Design a protein around this ligand. Structure first.
Ligand SMILES: [Mg+2]
Ligand SMILES: [Mg+2]
Ligand SMILES: [Mg+2]
Ligand SMILES: [Mg+2]
Lengths: 145, 49, 102, 48, 112, 154, 116
RNA sequence: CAAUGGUAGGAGAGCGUUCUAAGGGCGUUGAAGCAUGAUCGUAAGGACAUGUGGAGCGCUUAGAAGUGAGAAUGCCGGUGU
RNA sequence: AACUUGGGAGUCAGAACAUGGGUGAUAAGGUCCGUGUUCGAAAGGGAAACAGCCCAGACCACCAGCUAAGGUCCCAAAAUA
RNA sequence: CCGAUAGUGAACCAGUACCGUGAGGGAAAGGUGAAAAGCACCCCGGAAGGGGAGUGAAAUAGAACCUGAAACCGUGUGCUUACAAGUAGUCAGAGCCCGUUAAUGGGUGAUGGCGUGCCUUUUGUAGAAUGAACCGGCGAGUUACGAUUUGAUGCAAGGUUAA
């Protein structure tokens, strides 16, 4: 138990990032975003505290799918009522409520712990060029190739 | 020898084995008899020969 | 002013004035120990040793050769009348670094 | 029909958090100065 | 600074008396007496007797003013239950506990 | 479970009551009746071969003779039982608190003179035994008793 | 001679109850469940004293990967290059140098890069 | 230098409890019990301190056993849900 | 290592997998034999979870290192090689 | 040899309370203190109880009276807890309280990893197979005689006695 550094809220510094979803594939942007807001790009990563940064995804209506999973790739959900299952294709989610699409794609790549939910709360997705978070002074973030 | 320092002959005495007292002794539950059948019953076993 | 020493089967990052706890060494209380396996020196001037740095002894004063807090190792198999219990207390040596050499 | 397990002390004391009585709806009697039930006769004096 | 009164082996179940005892803990003596006289539970007159006894003990043994007195603590703990039975159907007999209570009230002037 | 009073009827039927099957009220698990394997009256004495008995006596006496714990006196000639005189005799002989006095035969006066001194025991040459010799810190033996013991013990 | 079981059952049960201090409800008061929980705790502690070393190794790995990718270099390549260079600093010490002295870790990155 | 997972099961070494023998001790300036504590040993387990308690009890060596419980729809009591 | 003489046992319900076969229907997580392994009595890593499959046998510490089977976009350690 | 679940069923008005038509069956229940010195008097209360005063070395020794465990029930608090999925622990950990048989200290615990009780019986049990409401006490390889084997010890072509 000798000398491993542990981060706590008294020395965590979270920053803000904008990520453009124009011309990017759903899963490949989502995995990198999940890595950012988990805090895994930080040298000071600590698994029991929420190190990591806030992320804004701005365009999010320009996200693309390979193949033909626009018409395939159906999202199902149950209402907890008998026969209470309904579905929406990925293309319909993109044209109506594209913020939910990217939110859910990134959220599914985060752990289902309490920390995971808290970290997924640091994600703000907008289906259009503009965001209201100018007071937070975000920096543009380019996705790794 | 003295009556407060008396010693038996080495190798003459040995503690007897008490059976069915805990599992660290090795003879705890079934007491060295295995599990079932005549051999496990009290007064079980069969006439010699 | 910041060095990496190799002792026990481990490595420890030390700077002068620090108290370290290592696997038991063969010294007495109040003696001086010299670590001669130094892999890295930091601070303003950096010496990155391939195996060791070559030279760079680290001297320390040894105090309180002791035994750690008692662990009680216990294990049991479930429906088999099998369990084992035994204590353990690791010996350790407490040293205080007083010189990083290079 | 019959309990399947004990009720722990925690569960019991949770169930009886709302098992209590309220203080009486009482007011000082204007004539005699002693407490009485509001809209009732003051039993110490007998007024109103 | 403190006055005590205990009523031992009161033939009322302590779970039943602690309901009324919850209303007067930490209250002023006058308000406590009014609460007791106006709440309609079987345990109210019994607790009132212990309260008045504690107040009298205060006044008579320690000479403290019974106007600055607060109900410092009030509790009931179990006493020696009495075991009885009820004849149920088919010849079976079911136990009945007639429980008893040790009721303690201490009043204080809240000073030293 | 046989010697305990009563308990000869089956306390309740074997099946149907929901209770553990029982057969007597004095079974060992029941309170108030039945000890399984208790003490029984018996003897604890055994025998050792005769030569071993005499070797044990000789070894006890030899141990008491190498520790300088063997004092030989000529005679006792106590004409009346008097404890005080025997105590003075023992003190003049510088004997430890625990001492075994050995006479040739049963000296009534010496026996009576040493009954009430605590830690002094009287015996004859034929009455010697290993436990008594090993208990005493010193032996005070009369010359005639010494010769008799030498004759008897080989 | 008879011996009744006085003052050994209590001491043995009590020092297990004391060892179950802080457990929920029945598990710090009743001997039967306190013993089971102390047993399960001994087993868990034995397993976790081994799990701990691999958990901390993977923590150090993650930190080194994050520190290395700031120099456009993967963890795999960095470790391979440090082996090529003959450097034998553990993952623990690498993580601490990256946390404390960024310049020194940059120097280690270059010395592993030129060992290509 | 080598070995040390383990059930039926074999073997060995020990920890405690009551009693007895002998020696040596402790106790109203407070014994045994009980309670608490952050103490010691590889385990069984051994101390120390301080409260409670108010007259008995350790240690050594050796002898005997009604010598160790979590389970038997166990038995008796007490107390819950 | 093996064998002989003696003291003490327990076992006589086995399971899956692979493979050579009978039976059944080139059915069964079927049943009966031959052969090996594992479980039984085996923790650890992998196979999502999963006695019997794959890797591998826990004397006890360590916040050291190298590998096996399996892996290296995120959950989740390591190639968006 | 037993020291109130033991030792007689019965240490105490016990073959008695009690059960049965009857033969019969059959309990449970010891301990104030050295001395009764067993609380004069005052106060609340109808009383029961209590608080003073006093007796006593001691009164949480006050008559249910030596000690007074555990289950169980309360009253206060230091730290925590109302977005969370829990065989309840363990490993890692900040914050907040505290300070010990002073030693890399004690209490709690945001959050992360791992983690389906125990016994029995089974090829195999988290098992929705068995058993235990909880706590305490009691509760199962013994003794005698013979046989055999191994260790020990004497003596040895001899060894040993039984009544
Ligand atoms: Mg009827
Ligand atoms: Mg079950
Ligand atoms: Mg269930
Ligand atoms: Mg049941």
């Amino acid at each position: 138990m000798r000398q491993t550094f542990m981060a706590n809220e008294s020395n965590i510094e979270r920053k803000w990032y904008v990520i453009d979803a124009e011309g990017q594939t759903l899963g490949r942007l989502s995995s990198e975003v999940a890595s950012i807001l988990r805090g895994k790009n930080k040298v000071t990563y600590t698994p029991h505290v929420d190190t990591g940064d806030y992320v804004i995804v701005i365009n999010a209506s320009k996200i693309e799918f390979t193949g033909n999973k626009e018409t395939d790739k159906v999202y199902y959900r149950h209402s907890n009522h008998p026969g209470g299952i309904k579905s929406i294709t990925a293309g319909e989610l993109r044209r109506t409520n594209p913020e939910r699409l990217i939110e859910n794609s990134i959220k599914g790549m985060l752990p289902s712990t309490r920390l995971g939910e808290k970290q997924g709360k640091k994600l703000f997705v907008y289906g259009g060029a503009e965001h209201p978070h100018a007071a937070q002074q975000p920096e543009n973030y380019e996705l790794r190739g | 020898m003295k009556l407060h320092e008396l010693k038996p002959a080495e190798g003459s005495r040995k503690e007897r084995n008490r059976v069915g007292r805990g599992v660290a002794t090795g003879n705890g539950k079934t007491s060295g008899r295995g599990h079932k059948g005549q051999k496990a019953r009290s007064g079980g076993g069969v006439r010699p020969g | 002013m910041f060095a990496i020493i190799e002792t026990g089967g481990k490595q420890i990052k030390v700077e002068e004035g620090q108290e370290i706890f290592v696997e038991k060494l063969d010294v007495n209380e109040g003696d001086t120990f010299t670590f001669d396996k130094v892999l890295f020196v930091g601070g303003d001037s950096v010496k990155v040793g391939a195996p060791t740095v070559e030279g760079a002894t680290v001297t320390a004063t040894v105090n309180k050769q002791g035994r750690g807090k008692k662990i009680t190792v216990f294990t049991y198999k479930r429906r088999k009348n099998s369990k084992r219990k035994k204590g353990h207390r690791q010996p350790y040596t407490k040293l205080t670094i007083d010189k990083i050499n290079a | 029909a019959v309990p399947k397990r004990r009720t722990s002390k925690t569960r019991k004391n949770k169930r009886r958090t709302h098992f209590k009585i309220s203080v009486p709806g009482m007011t000082e009697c204007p004539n005699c100065g002693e407490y009485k039930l509001s809209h009732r006769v003051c039993k110490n004096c007998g007024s109103y | 600074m403190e006055a005590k009164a205990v009523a031992r082996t009161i033939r009322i179940a302590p779970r039943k008396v602690r309901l009324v005892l919850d209303l007067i803990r930490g209250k002023n003596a006058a308000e406590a007496i009014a609460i007791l006289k106006l709440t309609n539970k079987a345990s109210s007159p019994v607790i009132e007797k212990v309260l008045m006894s504690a107040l009298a003990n205060a006044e008579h043994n320690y000479d403290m003013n019974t106007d600055e007195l607060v109900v410092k603590e009030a509790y009931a703990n179990e006493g020696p239950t009495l075991k009885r039975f009820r004849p149920r159907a088919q010849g079976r007999a079911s136990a009945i506990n007639k429980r008893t209570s040790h009721i303690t009230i201490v009043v204080s002037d809240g000073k030293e | 479970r046989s010697a305990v009073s009563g308990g000869g009827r089956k306390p309740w039927k074997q099946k149907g009551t929901g209770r553990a099957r029982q057969g007597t009220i004095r079974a060992p698990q029941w309170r108030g009746g039945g000890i399984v394997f208790g003490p029984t009256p018996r003897s604890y004495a055994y025998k050792m071969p005769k030569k071993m008995r005499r070797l044990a006596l000789r070894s006890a006496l030899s141990f008491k003779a190498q520790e300088n714990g063997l004092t030989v006196v000529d005679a006792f000639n106590f004409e009346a039982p008097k404890t005080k005189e025997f105590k003075n005799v023992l003190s003049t002989l510088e004997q430890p608190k625990k001492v075994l006095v050995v006479t040739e035969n049963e000296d009534v006066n010496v026996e009576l003179s040493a009954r009430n001194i605590p830690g002094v025991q009287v015996t004859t040459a034929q009455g010697l035994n290993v436990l008594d010799i090993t208990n005493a810190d010193s032996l005070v033996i009369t010359e005639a008793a010494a010769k008799k013991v030498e004759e008897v013990l080989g | 001679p008879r011996v009744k079981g006085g003052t050994v059952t209590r001491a043995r049960r009590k020092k297990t109850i004391k060892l179950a201090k802080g457990y929920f409800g029945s598990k710090h008061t009743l001997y039967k469940v306190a013993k089971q929980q102390v047993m399960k705790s001994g087993q868990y502690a034995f397993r976790d004293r081994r799990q701990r070393k691999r958990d901390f190794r993977k923590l150090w790995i993650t930190r080194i990967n994050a520190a290395a990718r700031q120099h456009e270099m993967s963890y795999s390549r960095l470790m391979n290059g440090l082996k090529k260079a003959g450097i034998d600093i553990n993952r623990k010490m690498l993580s601490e140098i990256a946390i404390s002295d960024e310049k020194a870790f940059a120097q280690l990155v270059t010395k592993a890069k030129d060992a290509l």
